[PDB]
Amino acid sequence: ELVDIPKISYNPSELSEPRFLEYSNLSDKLHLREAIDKILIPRVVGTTNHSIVREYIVQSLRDLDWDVEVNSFHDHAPIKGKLHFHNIIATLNPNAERYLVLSCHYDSKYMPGVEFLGATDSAVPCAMLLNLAQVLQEQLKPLKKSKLSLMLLFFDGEEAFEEWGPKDSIYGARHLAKKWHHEGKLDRIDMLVLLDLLGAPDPAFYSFFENTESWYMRIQSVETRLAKLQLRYFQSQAMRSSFIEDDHIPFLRRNVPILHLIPVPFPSVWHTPDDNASVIDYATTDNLALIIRLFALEYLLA
Numbered sequence: 001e002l003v004d005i006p007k008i009s010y011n012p013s014e015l016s017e018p019r020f021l022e023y024s025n026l027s028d029k030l031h032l033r034e035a036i037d038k039i040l041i042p043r044v045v046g047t048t049n050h051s052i053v054r055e056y057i058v059q060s061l062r063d064l065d066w067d068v069e070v071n072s073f074h075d076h077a078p079i080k081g082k083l084h085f086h087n088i089i090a091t092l093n094p095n096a097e098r099y100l101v102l103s104c105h106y107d108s109k110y111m112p113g114v115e116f117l118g119a120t121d122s123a124v125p126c127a128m129l130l131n132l133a134q135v136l137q138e139q140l141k142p143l144k145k146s147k148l149s150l151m152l153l154f155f156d157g158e159e160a161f162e163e164w165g166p167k168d169s170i171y172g173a174r175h176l177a178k179k180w181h182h183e184g185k186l187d188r189i190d191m192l193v194l195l196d197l198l199g200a201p202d203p204a205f206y207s208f209f210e211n212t213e214s215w216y217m218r219i220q221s222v223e224t225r226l227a228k229l230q231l232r233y234f235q236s237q238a239m240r241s242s243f244i245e246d247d248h249i250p251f252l253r254r255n256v257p258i259l260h261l262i263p264v265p266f267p268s269v270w271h272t273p274d275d276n277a278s279v280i281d282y283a284t285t286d287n288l289a290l291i292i293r294l295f296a297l298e299y300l301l302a
């Protein structure tokens, strides 16, 4: 069921016009396309390419002066058996009291007998987050020292190896949510924003969670303001009784507020080899990446 979002949840863009104009003109299309190209390789957990993609993410952010921790652990999967998973946790201020967290998964789904590239799922999301760090590096500098800072979290082992279920899915997220819960490190997450299945044409977004509906409406407003300045995806509706499972689930279950940036319906190529370079709509990709960059600045800088 879709419900119209009530007025109480409206939360318009607050950046001054000049800063909104200035920040909305920051981009690096070439870097975004280069990041996509680097990441868009088969990258099943435990493979050489999986390590190559992790190294690229880690080095890219370390080169931009982010603190980067790799959370490594072993778990058992159907088919593959024992695997070494590696969540990537990048922060501007590793000593922050609070974080906005932007996140996605960097593994690609294991598909017997075929290469699966997972362009929308989630090579493009991963590239959008690296590109965000590159494009906004000047504006983000103060967040290296502030009490509220930014974390980019690249989950490992999101995908099932045999059949999606509670014991065969979201390996990295389940591990990390349990670890941080045990360590009292979940309360510091203001909100976990999860990007998934982005880069295909004509995505439609809805608000899934009432406690983040107001911040959903800030993204909606960012999109409206960009349109007005002539520079739609986010619907002003909430989807109730939606039970879409993803990396956020183990955080959601432990009281962490979630903003789930995933289109409904999913792209038509979902979990087929057609989720490749050819499905990427670059106009939609540049657009969504810009909207997300501005959302991050709205939240963090205000």
Ligand SMILES: COc1ccc(NC(=S)NCCCn2ccnc2)cc1OC
Pocket: 121, 159, 196, 197, 243, 244, 245, 246, 264, 265, 266, 270
């Ligand atoms: C085909 O369209 C759908 C298919 C499945 C579901 N239901 C669930 S619970 N999906 C969890 C997806 C986990 N995931 C995310 C990226 N790679 C894997 C909903 C769909 O449309 C609303």
Ligand SMILES: [Cl-]
Pocket: 047, 048, 049, 050
């Ligand atoms: Cl490989």
Ligand SMILES: [Zn+2]
Pocket: 109, 121, 159, 271
């Ligand atoms: Zn998937």
